[PDB]
Write an enzyme that holds these catalytic residues in place. Structure first.
Site, mmCIF file in Angstrom:
data_model
loop_
_atom_site.group_PDB
_atom_site.id
_atom_site.type_symbol
_atom_site.label_atom_id
_atom_site.label_comp_id
_atom_site.label_asym_id
_atom_site.label_seq_id
_atom_site.Cartn_x
_atom_site.Cartn_y
_atom_site.Cartn_z
ATOM 1 N N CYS A 260 0.832 -1.205 -0.159
ATOM 2 C CA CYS A 260 -0.019 0.011 -0.066
ATOM 3 C C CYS A 260 0.598 1.354 -0.132
ATOM 4 C CB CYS A 260 -1.155 -0.072 1.055
ATOM 5 S SG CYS A 260 -1.985 1.465 1.253
ATOM 6 N N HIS B 94 -0.070 1.407 -3.583
ATOM 7 C CA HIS B 94 -1.404 2.107 -3.573
ATOM 8 C C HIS B 94 -1.137 3.187 -4.875
ATOM 9 C CE1 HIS B 94 -5.450 3.830 -3.030
ATOM 10 N NE2 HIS B 94 -5.671 2.627 -2.489
HETATM 11 CU CU CU Z 1 -3.836 0.680 2.569
#
Ligand code: CU
Ligand code: CU
Lengths: 187, 187
Positions: A105, A125
């Protein structure tokens, strides 16, 4: 002997991206240490889930080495990881001993902060891409999980299972990863 | 006014099936109360993740009513829910006021224990099917998420996102569920 994982837990970490890899790695028989960046006290995650770490990072870092160091995401969690001298030292040592580093992420932006794995193909992300690509030190990938040698990255809460199972495969092999996967009722 | 969710957290609960719905519901702007079955103290989940609840169930049950009552799974967590008089009373009241009840994995077997929603089509973890179907009081479904009126059920850790987004859609509508879904990077 079982493999060992260090998961570094900072305030603002994405709780899904923390719990899913910890749970899946433990299903794989990996000895997982959830270590609190700031000490031994419970950690307030990005949504309001409070998790009590197994140890402080200060203590856990003395019980290495680990077969994988795992960095959860969450925008503010990753900023905390990026600012930490202890994290910098741990990642440099892991990189130096050719051990696996796994980040999901916003987590991979801590690799950038600590100058880890430059030249690797990585994903993050979508909202963290610009931060990760500042300076052009990595090559960006839109794969849900990306693995370039000892740098393993992934995109977000919805890629957390794939990310965790990739760690399991890297450490314990495809057959164990397949066995762990089946009872999860994944698509 | 925002919708309100009660998530009942017992020792042995599956931590993924607890954290994913809590996190996703909070992303949806739902006010979520994580309530500890046994009191206010942190709860040891099925893998070894320790989560500190927002309140004791004893206190939270006095702050109803809730728009949804959520039962996480995990074999031993669900057994604890099944044995609890407080859970029985909460579910009966929710069923009586025509509120949503949502249960995932082994969670739905607590509905059986408390005689909730008999005649509903339901799903569970594949390994929990025989327990749920004892007596033939429900009709079994292999759908990843099943919703029969006010009874919403799902299968396991890998269906947790679909389960959570179904709760969001039931409470806040399809458009909010779609908005919450996009940043999760689901497949
Ligand atoms: Cu995240
Ligand atoms: Cu489960």
């Amino acid at each position: 002997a079982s493999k060992r994982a260090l998961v570094i837990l900072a305030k603002g970490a994405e709780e899904m991206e923390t719990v899913i890899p910890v749970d899946v790695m433990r299903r794989a028989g990996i000895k997982v240490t959830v270590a609190g960046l700031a000490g031994k006290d419970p950690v307030q995650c990005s949504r309001d889930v409070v998790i009590a770490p197994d140890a402080s990072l200060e203590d856990a870092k003395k019980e290495g080495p680990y077969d994988v160091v795992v960095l959860p995401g969450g925008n503010l969690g990753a900023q905390n990881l990026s600012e930490s001298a202890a994290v910098k030292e741990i990642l440099k040592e892991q990189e130096n001993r050719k051990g696996l580093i796994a980040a999901i992420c916003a987590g991979p932006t801590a690799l950038l902060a600590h100058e880890i794995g430059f030249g690797s193909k990585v994903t993050t992300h979508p909202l963290a891409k610009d931060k990760m690509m500042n300076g052009g030190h990595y090559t960006y990938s839109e794969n849900r999980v990306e693995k370039d040698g000892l740098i393993l990255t992934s995109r977000g809460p919805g890629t957390s299972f794939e990310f965790a199972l990739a760690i399991v495969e890297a450490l314990n092999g495809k057959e164990v990863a397949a066995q762990v996967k089946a009872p999860l009722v994944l698509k």
